[PDB]
Amino acid sequence: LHKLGGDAWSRARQKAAEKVRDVAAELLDIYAQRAAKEGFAFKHDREQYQLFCDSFPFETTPDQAQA
Amino acid sequence: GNRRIRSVGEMAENQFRVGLVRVERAVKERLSLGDLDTLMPQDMINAKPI
């Protein structure tokens, strides 16, 4: 419970913003390649995947099938 | 018809209000100054004049 005018929230906000500086090389390189690069797309097989479905020697639960 | 009682209640009320004149002067000074983003009704009020 931050007492009103206690400025601890302001101090923590400034500290976080210091941590949130965009010179942070922990994730801003990920955001740079997010602004510069892309990803791979998997293609689905409608037929061979059924063979491995039949290689599954049980019944999928409804909550796992949607997963 | 020209002179009246001013009993203990009214005198204490007027001394209370002339006490409050100082603290409302203080809060009007403080609020007329800026830096209002952090203010709370604790420092502008001061019970020592009261």
Side-chain angles (χ1 to χ4, degrees), chain A residues 5-6 8 12 16-17 23-25 27-65:
Chain A
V23 285
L27 295 182
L28 276 296
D29 70 272
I30 290 175
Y31 304 142
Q33 59 88 30
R34 202 175 289 274
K37 263 75 71 180
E38 284 314 311
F40 175 60
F42 279 116
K43 60 95 175 179
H44 68 115
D45 56 354
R46 288 262 65 107
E47 298 85 5
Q48 194 76 255
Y49 160 73
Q50 217 56 47
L51 199 155
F52 201 52
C53 287
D54 292 331
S55 176
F56 166 56
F58 294 104
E59 160 182 336
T60 317
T61 74
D63 206 5
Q64 195 196 344

Side-chain angles (χ1 to χ4, degrees), chain B residues 3-18:
Chain B
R3 297 142 64 68
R4 84 198 194 101
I5 308 291
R6 191 168 62 163
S7 43
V8 56
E10 317 188 0
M11 291 146 97
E13 164 201 308
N14 287 133
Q15 296 321 112
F16 190 103
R17 200 203 58 87
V18 69

